[PDB]
Structure formats: structure tokens, C-alpha cells
């Protein structure tokens, strides 16, 4: 049961990076798990229901790397802490590129792929804000913008500049500057006055 | 000739309020042009181009604008200077919202959307980062990063976050809040050791 499942998804995973989703058919994924057309549909109603369950296991899977993160004090100088986080995102979805560009390319078409990264974002953007209000109140940053709107700003800054390098396209920042980049902008723009 | 060609773009660009691209038909923007359904064919292969067409319209005048701006000496303190040209695309992208939209979720399925917008992109951070460069030549911006890539996480943070807003996406910044929250973000990150 759990095993045709997970061929399946391995199977779609693998096709993503070859080609986008429309260029795969449901007879690709069957044969790739070694399943007939009619058990596939068995586990999945579409194979754009297989790619929402890639997104929300890789989706799922930075955010428990960030719980991982904030539950544990460590937490060097500012700079470090929070390259350590931006890192997650980095190293999540920079391990998962195809998946990523096809979740992207289906958010515009799949109000549930645009509901599952916003629920993401939501949270992610939430505890950004959470960690610069408690750097303004232990007196390391100073109080200039409002918290959540510089989150949001950065967060996004975060998924474009990210997927612009995993996908290759120009303009980009290189995949190798990227993180430096991001790290200033975040550091400068939070601790700045 | 020309008058028939402006009644189809005008069309166009009222209908994409209400609805998307795959929603209007041939059909509709003939009628509303006042003109037959060959006639359209005339004017324009498809639906599609005439979206390009009105994208490339809407591009084209932000171009002009920041030329202008350019050419002229004017420039205040230097946050003033930046907040004059992001402003130039919060208000022509601003005016023209539903182009806009369509022509982001267009870039995904389209080759020559994504090609025009590639193109314009590399013109404002080229200019981006050619601003950055003359400001650590007058000593005023310390030398951090590499001002390119700088540029670019800028200006793709500026494309998300505007489009965003314009959109009403949750999360994003309101429309109202957007300027103040780009320019802080440039400013500290540009003048910031």
C-alpha cells in the first residue's frame, strides 16, 4: 500500500526533472512504479495530486528543519543566527529543484498549491517577525519599520531570489552567492537605522 | 487600421479585470471590438499575443518613465532618489493591474512573456547597479557585496512583493505600506556597512 505510493512519488520526482507536468502522463508514472493505469488511480485522482503531496512533504519537511532550529537555544552572533535559517530554505528546496519548479508554475493554475505554500509562508513570515520584535526589545535593533510588513518584504525577497537561482534563470544571483546575498540584505535592513 | 488594433487591446485589458486569459474567448474580444471574428485574425494570431502585446505596452512605458528620470540631474538626499524610481513601478504596474497579473501566471506557459520581462529586468538592474557603483565612487556606499548581485535580489524582491500587493495575496505587504517598506530595505542595504 505505503510501498505503490512511494513509487509512484519517487517515479514523479524523477520525471519532474527531466520534464514539466504537462509533458507527463499518468501512463508515464504507472509504468515508472510498476503499476497499471487503474491502481494508480487508486492511490492518486490526477498526477497533479501527486505533485501536491511532492510539494507538501518537501514543504513539511524545511518546516520541522526550522523547528529543529528555534527550539534549541544556540544562536551565535545576530549574523549567524540568522544565516543558520535562511539556510534551511536553501538547502530544502535546493535539494528538491524540480519539485520546486513545478509547485511554482502550478500555484497560477491549483488553488490548492497556492493554499499549501501560503499557509507555509504565513508561518514562516510570522516567526521572522516574532525574532525581530525580541531583538528590538532586548535593545540590539531599532525600531523602524513595523516587524511583520519587513518580514513579509524579506520573506518574499527569499522565494524569488531562491528560485530564480535553482531554476536558472536570468536575472539571477549565482546558486553559490546567494546565501551572502540575502544574509546582508536581511542583517543590514533589520539591524540598520 | 491602427483604430481596430487599439479597440481589441482596450477590450482586452477591460475583460482581464473580471476574469483570466482562459476565460476569455476569440469570440468575446471581437465583439467587444466591434468587429467580426476574422477580422480579429487579422490583427492578431491569438489571445495570447494580444496579452504580450499589452504587457509590452505597459513595460515600454515604466522604460520611458525611468529614462526620463534618469536624465535629468534631480536628486535629493539619496533616499529621496531611490524612492522617486521605485515609485515609477509602483505607479505604472500599479495603473495597470490586471495586465499585470495576467502576465505574471503567462510566464509559466510562454516563452515570449518570460522573454520580455527577462529582457526589461536586466535593463533596471544593470541601471541598479550601475547607481550603487557611482555612489561607492563618491564615498557614499561602502563596498560590500558585488553590486550586481545586489542589484538583483533587489529588484526580484521588488518584482514579488509589488505583485503581491497589487494582487492582494496573503501573505503580502498593503499596497499602501509597499513604498515606505521597499525603500527602507534599499536604503539600509545600499548605505549599511
Known sequence: ?????????????????????????????????????????????????????????????????????????????????????????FETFGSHKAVTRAGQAARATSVEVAELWSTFMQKWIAYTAAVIDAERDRGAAPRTLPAHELATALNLMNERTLFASFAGEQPSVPEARVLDTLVHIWVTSIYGE
Open 1 to 89: 500500500g505505503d510501498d505503490r505510493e512511494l513509487a509512484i512519488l519517487a517515479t514523479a520526482e524523477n520525471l519532474l526533472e527531466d520534464r514539466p507536468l504537462a509533458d507527463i502522463s499518468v501512463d508515464d508514472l504507472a509504468k515508472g512504479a510498476g503499476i497499471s493505469r487503474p491502481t494508480f488511480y487508486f492511490y492518486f485522482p490526477s498526477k497533479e495530486a501527486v505533485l501536491l503531496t511532492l510539494l507538501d512533504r518537501v514543504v513539511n519537511q524545511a518546516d520541522m528543519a526550522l523547528q529543529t532550529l528555534a527550539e534549541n537555544p544556540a544562536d551565535t552572533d545576530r549574523e549567524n543566527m540568522w544565516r543558520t535559517g535562511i539556510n534551511v530554505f
